[PDB]
Amino acid sequence: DHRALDVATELAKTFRVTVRERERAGGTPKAERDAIRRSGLLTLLISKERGGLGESWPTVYEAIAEIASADASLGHLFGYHFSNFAYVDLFASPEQKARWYPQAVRERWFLGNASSENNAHVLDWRVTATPLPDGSYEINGTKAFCSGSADADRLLVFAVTSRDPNGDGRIVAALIPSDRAGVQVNGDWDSLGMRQTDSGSVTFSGVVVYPDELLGTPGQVTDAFASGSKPSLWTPITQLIFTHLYLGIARGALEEAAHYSRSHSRPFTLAGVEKATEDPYVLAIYGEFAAQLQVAEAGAREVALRVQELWERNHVTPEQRGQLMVQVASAKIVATRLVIELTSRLYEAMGARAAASRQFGFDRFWRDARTHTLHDPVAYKIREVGNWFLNHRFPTPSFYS
Amino acid sequence: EDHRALDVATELAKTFRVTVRERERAGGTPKAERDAIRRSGLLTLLISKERGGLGESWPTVYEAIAEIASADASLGHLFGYHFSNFAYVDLFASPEQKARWYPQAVRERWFLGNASSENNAHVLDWRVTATPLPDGSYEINGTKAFCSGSADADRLLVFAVTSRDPNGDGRIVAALIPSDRAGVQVNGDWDSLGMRQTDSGSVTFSGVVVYPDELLGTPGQVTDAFASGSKPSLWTPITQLIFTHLYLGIARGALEEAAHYSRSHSRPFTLAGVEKATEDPYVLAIYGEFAAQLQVAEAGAREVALRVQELWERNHVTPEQRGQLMVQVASAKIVATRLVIELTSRLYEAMGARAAASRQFGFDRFWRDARTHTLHDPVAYKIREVGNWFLNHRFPTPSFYS
Amino acid sequence: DHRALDVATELAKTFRVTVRERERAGGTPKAERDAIRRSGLLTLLISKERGGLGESWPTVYEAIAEIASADASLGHLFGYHFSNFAYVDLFASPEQKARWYPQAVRERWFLGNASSELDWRVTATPLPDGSYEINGTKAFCSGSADADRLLVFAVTSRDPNGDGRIVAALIPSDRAGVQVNGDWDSLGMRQTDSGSVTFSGVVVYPDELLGTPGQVTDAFASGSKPSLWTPITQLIFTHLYLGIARGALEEAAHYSRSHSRPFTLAGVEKATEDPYVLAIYGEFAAQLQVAEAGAREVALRVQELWERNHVTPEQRGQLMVQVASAKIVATRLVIELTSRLYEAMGARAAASRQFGFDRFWRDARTHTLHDPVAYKIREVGNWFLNHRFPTPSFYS
Amino acid sequence: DHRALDVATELAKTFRVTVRERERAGGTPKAERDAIRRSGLLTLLISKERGGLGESWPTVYEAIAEIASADASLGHLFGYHFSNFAYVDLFASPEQKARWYPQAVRERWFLGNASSENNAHVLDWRVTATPLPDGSYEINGTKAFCSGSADADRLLVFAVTSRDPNGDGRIVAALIPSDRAGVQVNGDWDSLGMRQTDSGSVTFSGVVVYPDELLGTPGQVTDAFASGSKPSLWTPITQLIFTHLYLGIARGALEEAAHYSRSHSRPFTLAGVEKATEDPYVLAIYGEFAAQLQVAEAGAREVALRVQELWERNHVTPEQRGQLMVQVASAKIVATRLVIELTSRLYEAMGARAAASRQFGFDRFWRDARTHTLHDPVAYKIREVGNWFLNHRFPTPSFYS
């Protein structure tokens, strides 16, 4: 059954036609986000019983890579939607799922994030939740890197409790409308790459969050991650989403370069080459990177299958979660090194005119990859894999590991 | 999910690790270990159960090769090459030949040797000639180099070029013959940097008669299969993926052995402000970089191995199927080659000076083994082949190396 | 005597203030080119006897790198000026130089190129009085805007004495028939005005010609002193790449000191104490130190041979090998450093497009493609393995 | 004069003839050490007035690299002799120089080390110096990695004071005869590479050190290093010696590979080239490594000239010493990466037969380089250069930085 993947492939084809012009402007790719809404793919992981497609994580990951190969910003938005959905599904109550999931199908929800990317200790988080009557909370503060925060049907929001008789310093998460009073999407995203992901800041001014919007009790995510209960799959799932962004960009860059080489590169006739496509060093560049891409992609498919396997389990052991996170981290490390090298070095196969003509726009691939690969430092993913291999220590679960 | 065969290979590898350091110094023929492999039954992994074999798959074979190679690269090589030789026989032998040979191979515990599918020369430049005799036999003459596993071999897979042949000179003939056939001399002239117990020296054929029931196909049939990209040309991707698993196995064995050394000799650098080398950020980074690359390379290799099995089971294979497989194998080999050559050298940086000051530690065996065999055929042309496919949509030209 | 270098350092300091906004616009950095004119440094290699500074190639190369570290386009324009000057000096007669060089000092000449860079089809048709008419369109004409003179190359055509012979001339950029097309819109090197120039019936007078037709080809085939132009110019490129590398490293370090946060899971209090941040700076700073030190030695050898009356193909070939080696190392270094330093700075260095650090990669990524480093590598390999010096050309 | 370098070149040629058989056996290369004695080059830095050659550090460094290119163990021994000589010369009194230097010419001293390479805090040093009457000290203990300790005419020895009314924990350095009673060279060097450097352990049993053998007063080296006086040049001098071992090994390996390639120019059967010396990928391997070698050697010559410049100064500032040490560390880092990569990857240019015949012996270059590059961890030389560049901190003078 390749129906969903065919739909994603067709979306990506349409995105390729316009990405060069669209991403220069930045801003919100509303038309393309609506095209994704109409495709139904946002419901890939919602059961057929609840109106979704009843598909699997391997399909999601392949769709993410395909879309990202055409437009990295749309790939990012699409993949982040599923990271946000994964968080919801891992913490939501039975009655929340019975209400939200049919509604997400009917209303074609595209989920945004504000924000699960807090590069700081919990007591230093920008956004605080203070109690209101009847179990509600009030959210205040400004957070940056709110991925996909424009045109979002719901925002997955995070805050730390304050002035709370039931405990200060606890992480609360909630899924709220983006037009709730006091939510201000600031529109300040102007980035090197990932230019159409609307990953700017969001300011919360006295924003009300109701109990039926809270995703577990305050502090539950800390307990679930540290214990290795099922929600501890969120981070390997999400880090593998990022991995598929990088592999998608890598494949799109390699295929765009090859098209240029076949139609535009002149041979270095000084060295007796009649066609650039027959040049031994041009061929070596393509071979080195296509070979690494093939292996990285084949490996990523295996880890995606393991995500699905553990996703279906009722309980996951620390060894099972830790081995998965190590495999994901390994795939991310290899994909990061590959995409960053490839998107820069492929110019050496294409020649000077590929850079002399700014309009060719090939630098988009490097810009997009160079931007998002910094989400969290690959040096610490490397350290995490090393600490496991040498010392048998699995990574400490967190929002980044 | 039958893990019995892989358990047997794991136990074999365990025993080999105990003695490999002393054995590989001596070189020569690891007869005791070859006999342990014979007793294990694993040489029959790919023979059908109907013919007395284990009826297992290429994924199992490849995993077993990597496991054994991680303990002893020469024994992994010998074991892997046995299946390369077996694959050639299976792809070219008649059903009648197989009906006789495979039960015999099970009963007599055959360990196959090679003499030799590694020529590195145009057919006209081959040293070993096959002169036709009136009954359809061929007389073989010449000295063949790089005859891997040629010592203690129950049968040799032999290649020669026709000479003085009214039906055409320069055609490749292949046969499977006893190693004690009159005129066969295994020369034992192997004294190498690494892969020191693979007996990859020369074999001299002096008037060796190979009989018609030992010939594999007709003269030149392997060249025709290569030109067609047909199923018998699967021999090369199968064999190149065997090599890939030797390199992944050596890499895994090296990384684990290094980790063991680091944990038990964890003296930190004075100025480094570390209490333990196992907490040093730069030691951890070396292990992490190489372990990550190893995980991805291994996971990728498993996928290519499943595809080998799929096409192995087909009655017919198209050049497009064969070419895509060869590109995928070449890609895996390229990554595995770069990985094992970098890792076996750079892990010293994580272990520290005493790992090299003590020759007896013997860790350089991993680099020596990998550095030797990765030269079998130049990785630069595997890279060119993948690039020519990706850029120009040209599949590699089938050959004994591509 | 560091007076010239001090002038270059102060110019570079001024250029840093404005480069971020200027290079976005592209186009011609007229004000900064005029600052270079006022500095006198365009006359670095002209003898004091002819009104110049009487300085050495080592000083020129250090000034190029310094300016390039601040503004790669201005570094390129400045460096190319000296490539153009080197060509004039190697081929012009003493009588021509006695006129041109004091004029270049008085009129503050900034030389442009059209063009030093396979098969050339801009033609030079001989006229009876020794003049030529130039026709055709050149590409990649670096510094062709606001140029006091253009160094122009063409091949003879309709020539009873032999078609296809290369002629070179130094002509005013506003001579009738010269059209600078203004079509440069590039990834990096955005203010180098390296677009196309169209020649329509452009007259070249005999006293503007540099040597005789085909003389440059003869000099390449002989490996004689004028063939030094290529190693001189390839080492100019090398110093652009080393300068960009140093500028990028320093800009990154400033960001790391003033803006980088420690990764929350690092267990370190300051990003400047993070072991992996320190390893990135150390690995690239170390390579830069060795590359810069080696480049200084090769620059001294350029000067030594520049002063010789005659140069052998063995002297020229050995120098070219050393220049190629430096260029290879500098190319790899600058391309890796300008991309990887983001990993020492963090996500916010890319999240804020206005920071503009990608300029370094864009500039280096653009100009390092001038000629393929793969063939510089092959040339060094062919020398080391087969004892064959590079075949002299406009690229080797 | 190029006399000394001609002498070194001729020595190196002789060593190449026998290095394969000698390094396999290990042990002491006595005949070759005596050849170095006959050459006079051990006296390169002794003034002509004291009987030496009156030469300079740039000459010494070139000679080290030339000899190392032929035989890394002899290059190491020769280089370490000059590290030992530098230490002596930086601390010896006028009386000691007047006595020792003519004696070193006449007796042809080849200096050994036992040992300036203590990977441990001063208080934790293996070897102690306890006061004796009349200003003598008694040395007791075992130190490992005593480079060139066999057939050494004098040993440079280091110990820490104890039971010393004038201060415990102070570093004493002395130059003593190797046949002084109580000195036991243990002969336990059996290494991967550098196999003929006799870098095993030395045991001191009640060894007497007289006042006229002491190199300064106890603790003077620590004062000199901390102050940046002239003896603080010892570490950059010595680390640049190691750098020249690595560049020498690199050049020797590259030249040996090229000779093999030229005399075994068998092209790969399917390469489509007539000869391996015309293969594009063979040429790329030689070009990449030859290019890096040219730049590293040129940079090393510049740093050697700076060593000589500061060597002649009466005073060196902490900035001058720190800048030199940064330049030396940078050279050592680059040379380490280059030699380790080159000595392994050049097999790819030569082909399978270069490894199939162990007797070819090319692996000696990798084994020698792989062994000595671990002397002190390159990761911390990298950190030191990074700490300088990013934080403007020069390395703290020590025996390793």
Ligand SMILES: c1ccc2[nH]ccc2c1
């Ligand atoms: C680094 C770069 C871009 C990004 N968009 C959302 C997160 C994030 C992190």
Ligand SMILES: c1ccc2[nH]ccc2c1
């Ligand atoms: C080619 C290259 C290296 C080798 N080691 C054992 C066999 C063999 C063949």
Ligand SMILES: c1ccc2[nH]ccc2c1
């Ligand atoms: C001028 C400026 C940039 C360039 N890139 C390649 C050539 C070239 C010339």
Ligand SMILES: c1ccc2[nH]ccc2c1
């Ligand atoms: C002398 C010889 C070889 C060595 N390896 C590490 C240190 C050291 C010292």
